[PDB]
Amino acid sequence: SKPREWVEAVAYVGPDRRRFNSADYKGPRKRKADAS
Ligand SMILES: Nc1nc2c(ncn2[C@@H]2O[C@@H]3COP(=O)(O)O[C@H]4[C@@H](O)[C@H](n5cnc6c(=O)[nH]c(N)nc65)O[C@@H]4COP(=O)(O)O[C@H]3[C@H]2O)c(=O)[nH]1
Ligand SMILES: Nc1nc2c(ncn2[C@@H]2O[C@@H]3COP(=O)(O)O[C@H]4[C@@H](O)[C@H](n5cnc6c(=O)[nH]c(N)nc65)O[C@@H]4COP(=O)(O)O[C@H]3[C@H]2O)c(=O)[nH]1
């Protein structure tokens, strides 16, 4: 009805669309969390 998993951004408001993670990803990266 109302669980955790909540991200609040100015243009996006709602739960995180991320649930998959490929360390063998072949293509352009654009996620802030991909920074060391
Ligand atoms: N198709 C696709 N594009 C990807 C993916 N990962 C990153 N991107 C792209 O990278 C951009 C990073 O925007 P940001 O302002 O640095 O930072 C992001 C981020 O901080 C936040 N944000 C919005 N939606 C999400 C979300 O579902 N998850 C997370 N973790 N942050 C989000 O709002 C900012 C603006 O997001 P956008 O305008 O959507 O812009 C996103 C999006 O176009 C992915 O897996 N698939
Ligand atoms: N490290 C990294 N991996 C990336 C990036 N863009 C795509 N991927 C990978 O490619 C898959 C396909 O993304 P999609 O078809 O754009 O579809 C994405 C996208 O539409 C959405 N999404 C997630 N986070 C964001 C975000 O921050 N912004 C936007 N606009 N969409 C997001 O969630 C969907 C999840 O797709 P999946 O097939 O489960 O998993 C994602 C993810 O494993 C990226 O910038 N960095």
PDB file of N, CA and C and ligand atoms in Angstrom:
ATOM      1  N   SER A   1       0.862  -1.216   0.000  1.00  0.00           N
ATOM      2  CA  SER A   1       0.000   0.000   0.000  1.00  0.00           C
ATOM      3  C   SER A   1       0.888   1.253   0.000  1.00  0.00           C
ATOM      4  N   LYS A   2       1.975   1.209   0.788  1.00  0.00           N
ATOM      5  CA  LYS A   2       2.920   2.338   0.894  1.00  0.00           C
ATOM      6  C   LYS A   2       4.265   1.836   1.486  1.00  0.00           C
ATOM      7  N   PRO A   3       5.095   1.129   0.706  1.00  0.00           N
ATOM      8  CA  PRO A   3       6.416   0.606   1.193  1.00  0.00           C
ATOM      9  C   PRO A   3       7.520   1.662   1.032  1.00  0.00           C
ATOM     10  N   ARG A   4       8.752   1.313   1.443  1.00  0.00           N
ATOM     11  CA  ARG A   4       9.892   2.251   1.346  1.00  0.00           C
ATOM     12  C   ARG A   4      10.275   2.433  -0.145  1.00  0.00           C
ATOM     13  N   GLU A   5      11.587   2.412  -0.465  1.00  0.00           N
ATOM     14  CA  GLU A   5      12.071   2.555  -1.859  1.00  0.00           C
ATOM     15  C   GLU A   5      11.508   3.836  -2.520  1.00  0.00           C
ATOM     16  N   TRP A   6      11.858   5.012  -1.968  1.00  0.00           N
ATOM     17  CA  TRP A   6      11.348   6.304  -2.487  1.00  0.00           C
ATOM     18  C   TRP A   6      12.476   7.301  -2.813  1.00  0.00           C
ATOM     19  N   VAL A   7      12.555   7.705  -4.099  1.00  0.00           N
ATOM     20  CA  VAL A   7      13.544   8.693  -4.571  1.00  0.00           C
ATOM     21  C   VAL A   7      12.783   9.969  -4.976  1.00  0.00           C
ATOM     22  N   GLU A   8      13.233  11.139  -4.492  1.00  0.00           N
ATOM     23  CA  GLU A   8      12.566  12.423  -4.796  1.00  0.00           C
ATOM     24  C   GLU A   8      13.493  13.359  -5.598  1.00  0.00           C
ATOM     25  N   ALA A   9      13.144  13.570  -6.882  1.00  0.00           N
ATOM     26  CA  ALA A   9      13.902  14.449  -7.793  1.00  0.00           C
ATOM     27  C   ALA A   9      12.934  15.493  -8.375  1.00  0.00           C
ATOM     28  N   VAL A  10      13.457  16.670  -8.743  1.00  0.00           N
ATOM     29  CA  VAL A  10      12.630  17.785  -9.240  1.00  0.00           C
ATOM     30  C   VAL A  10      11.750  17.414 -10.447  1.00  0.00           C
ATOM     31  N   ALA A  11      12.283  16.627 -11.388  1.00  0.00           N
ATOM     32  CA  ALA A  11      11.512  16.245 -12.585  1.00  0.00           C
ATOM     33  C   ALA A  11      10.850  14.870 -12.409  1.00  0.00           C
ATOM     34  N   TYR A  12      11.448  14.025 -11.546  1.00  0.00           N
ATOM     35  CA  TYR A  12      10.921  12.673 -11.262  1.00  0.00           C
ATOM     36  C   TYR A  12      10.542  12.522  -9.779  1.00  0.00           C
ATOM     37  N   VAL A  13       9.299  12.100  -9.511  1.00  0.00           N
ATOM     38  CA  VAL A  13       8.825  11.854  -8.137  1.00  0.00           C
ATOM     39  C   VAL A  13       8.124  10.492  -8.139  1.00  0.00           C
ATOM     40  N   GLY A  14       8.644   9.548  -7.336  1.00  0.00           N
ATOM     41  CA  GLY A  14       8.083   8.191  -7.263  1.00  0.00           C
ATOM     42  C   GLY A  14       9.188   7.171  -6.954  1.00  0.00           C
ATOM     43  N   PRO A  15       8.887   5.868  -6.963  1.00  0.00           N
ATOM     44  CA  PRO A  15       9.910   4.796  -6.681  1.00  0.00           C
ATOM     45  C   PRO A  15      10.961   4.683  -7.801  1.00  0.00           C
ATOM     46  N   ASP A  16      12.137   4.167  -7.427  1.00  0.00           N
ATOM     47  CA  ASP A  16      13.284   3.983  -8.330  1.00  0.00           C
ATOM     48  C   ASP A  16      12.995   2.967  -9.446  1.00  0.00           C
ATOM     49  N   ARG A  17      13.242   3.396 -10.688  1.00  0.00           N
ATOM     50  CA  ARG A  17      13.022   2.560 -11.881  1.00  0.00           C
ATOM     51  C   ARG A  17      14.169   1.544 -12.066  1.00  0.00           C
ATOM     52  N   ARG A  18      15.166   1.588 -11.163  1.00  0.00           N
ATOM     53  CA  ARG A  18      16.334   0.675 -11.211  1.00  0.00           C
ATOM     54  C   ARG A  18      16.079  -0.571 -10.348  1.00  0.00           C
ATOM     55  N   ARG A  19      16.360  -1.748 -10.929  1.00  0.00           N
ATOM     56  CA  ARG A  19      16.174  -3.043 -10.262  1.00  0.00           C
ATOM     57  C   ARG A  19      17.116  -4.080 -10.897  1.00  0.00           C
ATOM     58  N   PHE A  20      17.694  -3.722 -12.056  1.00  0.00           N
ATOM     59  CA  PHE A  20      18.661  -4.567 -12.785  1.00  0.00           C
ATOM     60  C   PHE A  20      20.026  -3.862 -12.783  1.00  0.00           C
ATOM     61  N   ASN A  21      21.138  -4.626 -12.774  1.00  0.00           N
ATOM     62  CA  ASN A  21      22.485  -4.034 -12.818  1.00  0.00           C
ATOM     63  C   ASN A  21      23.387  -5.000 -13.602  1.00  0.00           C
ATOM     64  N   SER A  22      23.923  -4.540 -14.746  1.00  0.00           N
ATOM     65  CA  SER A  22      24.796  -5.359 -15.608  1.00  0.00           C
ATOM     66  C   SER A  22      26.251  -4.861 -15.519  1.00  0.00           C
ATOM     67  N   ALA A  23      27.198  -5.587 -14.888  1.00  0.00           N
ATOM     68  CA  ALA A  23      28.597  -5.107 -14.812  1.00  0.00           C
ATOM     69  C   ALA A  23      29.302  -5.276 -16.171  1.00  0.00           C
ATOM     70  N   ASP A  24      28.641  -6.031 -17.059  1.00  0.00           N
ATOM     71  CA  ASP A  24      29.132  -6.323 -18.419  1.00  0.00           C
ATOM     72  C   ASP A  24      28.329  -5.498 -19.438  1.00  0.00           C
ATOM     73  N   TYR A  25      27.899  -4.293 -19.026  1.00  0.00           N
ATOM     74  CA  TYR A  25      27.079  -3.424 -19.880  1.00  0.00           C
ATOM     75  C   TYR A  25      27.892  -2.848 -21.052  1.00  0.00           C
ATOM     76  N   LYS A  26      27.454  -3.153 -22.287  1.00  0.00           N
ATOM     77  CA  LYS A  26      28.101  -2.643 -23.508  1.00  0.00           C
ATOM     78  C   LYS A  26      27.230  -1.509 -24.086  1.00  0.00           C
ATOM     79  N   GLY A  27      27.624  -0.256 -23.800  1.00  0.00           N
ATOM     80  CA  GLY A  27      26.881   0.930 -24.258  1.00  0.00           C
ATOM     81  C   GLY A  27      27.269   2.162 -23.422  1.00  0.00           C
ATOM     82  N   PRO A  28      26.685   3.336 -23.688  1.00  0.00           N
ATOM     83  CA  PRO A  28      27.011   4.596 -22.920  1.00  0.00           C
ATOM     84  C   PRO A  28      26.412   4.580 -21.494  1.00  0.00           C
ATOM     85  N   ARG A  29      27.238   4.975 -20.508  1.00  0.00           N
ATOM     86  CA  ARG A  29      26.848   5.038 -19.080  1.00  0.00           C
ATOM     87  C   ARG A  29      26.422   6.481 -18.749  1.00  0.00           C
ATOM     88  N   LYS A  30      25.367   6.674 -17.910  1.00  0.00           N
ATOM     89  CA  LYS A  30      24.897   8.043 -17.559  1.00  0.00           C
ATOM     90  C   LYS A  30      24.407   8.128 -16.093  1.00  0.00           C
ATOM     91  N   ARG A  31      24.726   7.122 -15.259  1.00  0.00           N
ATOM     92  CA  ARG A  31      24.296   7.122 -13.838  1.00  0.00           C
ATOM     93  C   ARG A  31      25.380   7.704 -12.920  1.00  0.00           C
ATOM     94  N   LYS A  32      24.953   8.576 -12.001  1.00  0.00           N
ATOM     95  CA  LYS A  32      25.846   9.226 -11.029  1.00  0.00           C
ATOM     96  C   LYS A  32      26.584   8.191 -10.152  1.00  0.00           C
ATOM     97  N   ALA A  33      25.918   7.052  -9.893  1.00  0.00           N
ATOM     98  CA  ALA A  33      26.471   5.989  -9.027  1.00  0.00           C
ATOM     99  C   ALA A  33      27.549   5.164  -9.745  1.00  0.00           C
ATOM    100  N   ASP A  34      27.784   5.462 -11.029  1.00  0.00           N
ATOM    101  CA  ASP A  34      28.815   4.779 -11.836  1.00  0.00           C
ATOM    102  C   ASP A  34      30.164   5.495 -11.663  1.00  0.00           C
ATOM    103  N   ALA A  35      30.174   6.507 -10.778  1.00  0.00           N
ATOM    104  CA  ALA A  35      31.385   7.290 -10.471  1.00  0.00           C
ATOM    105  C   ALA A  35      32.040   6.739  -9.194  1.00  0.00           C
ATOM    106  N   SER A  36      33.362   6.512  -9.254  1.00  0.00           N
ATOM    107  CA  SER A  36      34.129   5.983  -8.109  1.00  0.00           C
ATOM    108  C   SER A  36      34.187   7.007  -6.963  1.00  0.00           C
TER     109      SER A  36
HETATM  110  N1  LIG B   1      17.259   5.155 -20.502  1.00  0.00           N
HETATM  111  C1  LIG B   1      18.066   5.287 -19.445  1.00  0.00           C
HETATM  112  N2  LIG B   1      18.585   6.485 -19.153  1.00  0.00           N
HETATM  113  C2  LIG B   1      19.378   6.446 -18.056  1.00  0.00           C
HETATM  114  C3  LIG B   1      19.674   5.361 -17.270  1.00  0.00           C
HETATM  115  N3  LIG B   1      20.525   5.722 -16.240  1.00  0.00           N
HETATM  116  C4  LIG B   1      20.725   6.994 -16.422  1.00  0.00           C
HETATM  117  N4  LIG B   1      20.058   7.520 -17.509  1.00  0.00           N
HETATM  118  C5  LIG B   1      20.030   8.931 -18.015  1.00  0.00           C
HETATM  119  O1  LIG B   1      21.017   9.697 -17.291  1.00  0.00           O
HETATM  120  C6  LIG B   1      20.436  10.928 -16.857  1.00  0.00           C
HETATM  121  C7  LIG B   1      21.128  11.418 -15.571  1.00  0.00           C
HETATM  122  O2  LIG B   1      20.490  12.607 -15.066  1.00  0.00           O
HETATM  123  P1  LIG B   1      21.078  13.436 -13.806  1.00  0.00           P
HETATM  124  O3  LIG B   1      20.512  14.804 -13.853  1.00  0.00           O
HETATM  125  O4  LIG B   1      22.548  13.255 -13.765  1.00  0.00           O
HETATM  126  O5  LIG B   1      20.440  12.677 -12.525  1.00  0.00           O
HETATM  127  C8  LIG B   1      19.139  12.056 -12.564  1.00  0.00           C
HETATM  128  C9  LIG B   1      18.881  11.357 -11.231  1.00  0.00           C
HETATM  129  O6  LIG B   1      19.627  11.973 -10.174  1.00  0.00           O
HETATM  130  C10 LIG B   1      17.375  11.548 -11.013  1.00  0.00           C
HETATM  131  N5  LIG B   1      16.507  10.410 -11.447  1.00  0.00           N
HETATM  132  C11 LIG B   1      15.393  10.430 -12.255  1.00  0.00           C
HETATM  133  N6  LIG B   1      14.821   9.266 -12.403  1.00  0.00           N
HETATM  134  C12 LIG B   1      15.606   8.409 -11.645  1.00  0.00           C
HETATM  135  C13 LIG B   1      15.471   7.016 -11.430  1.00  0.00           C
HETATM  136  O7  LIG B   1      14.612   6.262 -11.880  1.00  0.00           O
HETATM  137  N7  LIG B   1      16.473   6.527 -10.600  1.00  0.00           N
HETATM  138  C14 LIG B   1      17.484   7.293 -10.044  1.00  0.00           C
HETATM  139  N8  LIG B   1      18.367   6.659  -9.269  1.00  0.00           N
HETATM  140  N9  LIG B   1      17.607   8.604 -10.248  1.00  0.00           N
HETATM  141  C15 LIG B   1      16.637   9.093 -11.055  1.00  0.00           C
HETATM  142  O8  LIG B   1      16.978  12.711 -11.760  1.00  0.00           O
HETATM  143  C16 LIG B   1      18.041  13.134 -12.626  1.00  0.00           C
HETATM  144  C17 LIG B   1      17.473  13.401 -14.038  1.00  0.00           C
HETATM  145  O9  LIG B   1      17.115  12.176 -14.709  1.00  0.00           O
HETATM  146  P2  LIG B   1      16.759  12.137 -16.291  1.00  0.00           P
HETATM  147  O10 LIG B   1      16.293  13.480 -16.709  1.00  0.00           O
HETATM  148  O11 LIG B   1      15.906  10.954 -16.540  1.00  0.00           O
HETATM  149  O12 LIG B   1      18.201  11.867 -16.971  1.00  0.00           O
HETATM  150  C18 LIG B   1      18.934  10.652 -16.727  1.00  0.00           C
HETATM  151  C19 LIG B   1      18.677   9.648 -17.858  1.00  0.00           C
HETATM  152  O13 LIG B   1      18.318  10.322 -19.072  1.00  0.00           O
HETATM  153  C20 LIG B   1      19.122   4.094 -17.577  1.00  0.00           C
HETATM  154  O14 LIG B   1      19.282   3.030 -16.982  1.00  0.00           O
HETATM  155  N10 LIG B   1      18.318   4.145 -18.702  1.00  0.00           N
HETATM  156  N1  LIG B   2      25.000   1.307 -15.556  1.00  0.00           N
HETATM  157  C1  LIG B   2      24.066   1.675 -16.438  1.00  0.00           C
HETATM  158  N2  LIG B   2      23.202   0.765 -16.909  1.00  0.00           N
HETATM  159  C2  LIG B   2      22.323   1.297 -17.794  1.00  0.00           C
HETATM  160  C3  LIG B   2      22.244   2.599 -18.221  1.00  0.00           C
HETATM  161  N3  LIG B   2      21.209   2.751 -19.134  1.00  0.00           N
HETATM  162  C4  LIG B   2      20.694   1.560 -19.234  1.00  0.00           C
HETATM  163  N4  LIG B   2      21.314   0.612 -18.453  1.00  0.00           N
HETATM  164  C5  LIG B   2      21.029  -0.851 -18.348  1.00  0.00           C
HETATM  165  O1  LIG B   2      20.292  -1.237 -19.526  1.00  0.00           O
HETATM  166  C6  LIG B   2      19.005  -1.753 -19.159  1.00  0.00           C
HETATM  167  C7  LIG B   2      17.937  -1.226 -20.144  1.00  0.00           C
HETATM  168  O2  LIG B   2      17.507   0.111 -19.812  1.00  0.00           O
HETATM  169  P1  LIG B   2      16.272   0.836 -20.577  1.00  0.00           P
HETATM  170  O3  LIG B   2      15.753  -0.078 -21.622  1.00  0.00           O
HETATM  171  O4  LIG B   2      16.698   2.204 -20.945  1.00  0.00           O
HETATM  172  O5  LIG B   2      15.149   0.956 -19.416  1.00  0.00           O
HETATM  173  C8  LIG B   2      15.450   1.511 -18.121  1.00  0.00           C
HETATM  174  C9  LIG B   2      14.896   2.936 -18.015  1.00  0.00           C
HETATM  175  O6  LIG B   2      13.765   3.113 -18.876  1.00  0.00           O
HETATM  176  C10 LIG B   2      14.479   3.047 -16.539  1.00  0.00           C
HETATM  177  N5  LIG B   2      15.379   3.891 -15.683  1.00  0.00           N
HETATM  178  C11 LIG B   2      16.138   3.526 -14.591  1.00  0.00           C
HETATM  179  N6  LIG B   2      16.780   4.513 -14.035  1.00  0.00           N
HETATM  180  C12 LIG B   2      16.434   5.619 -14.798  1.00  0.00           C
HETATM  181  C13 LIG B   2      16.832   6.976 -14.657  1.00  0.00           C
HETATM  182  O7  LIG B   2      17.571   7.469 -13.809  1.00  0.00           O
HETATM  183  N7  LIG B   2      16.262   7.781 -15.630  1.00  0.00           N
HETATM  184  C14 LIG B   2      15.408   7.333 -16.627  1.00  0.00           C
HETATM  185  N8  LIG B   2      14.957   8.245 -17.491  1.00  0.00           N
HETATM  186  N9  LIG B   2      15.032   6.055 -16.756  1.00  0.00           N
HETATM  187  C15 LIG B   2      15.581   5.256 -15.810  1.00  0.00           C
HETATM  188  O8  LIG B   2      14.449   1.706 -15.995  1.00  0.00           O
HETATM  189  C16 LIG B   2      14.656   0.759 -17.050  1.00  0.00           C
HETATM  190  C17 LIG B   2      15.340  -0.513 -16.507  1.00  0.00           C
HETATM  191  O9  LIG B   2      15.845  -1.334 -17.580  1.00  0.00           O
HETATM  192  P2  LIG B   2      16.520  -2.784 -17.319  1.00  0.00           P
HETATM  193  O10 LIG B   2      16.474  -3.545 -18.587  1.00  0.00           O
HETATM  194  O11 LIG B   2      15.922  -3.366 -16.096  1.00  0.00           O
HETATM  195  O12 LIG B   2      18.073  -2.431 -17.005  1.00  0.00           O
HETATM  196  C18 LIG B   2      18.778  -1.374 -17.687  1.00  0.00           C
HETATM  197  C19 LIG B   2      20.201  -1.273 -17.131  1.00  0.00           C
HETATM  198  O13 LIG B   2      20.649  -2.537 -16.628  1.00  0.00           O
HETATM  199  C20 LIG B   2      23.158   3.566 -17.719  1.00  0.00           C
HETATM  200  O14 LIG B   2      23.213   4.764 -17.977  1.00  0.00           O
HETATM  201  N10 LIG B   2      24.054   3.009 -16.818  1.00  0.00           N
END
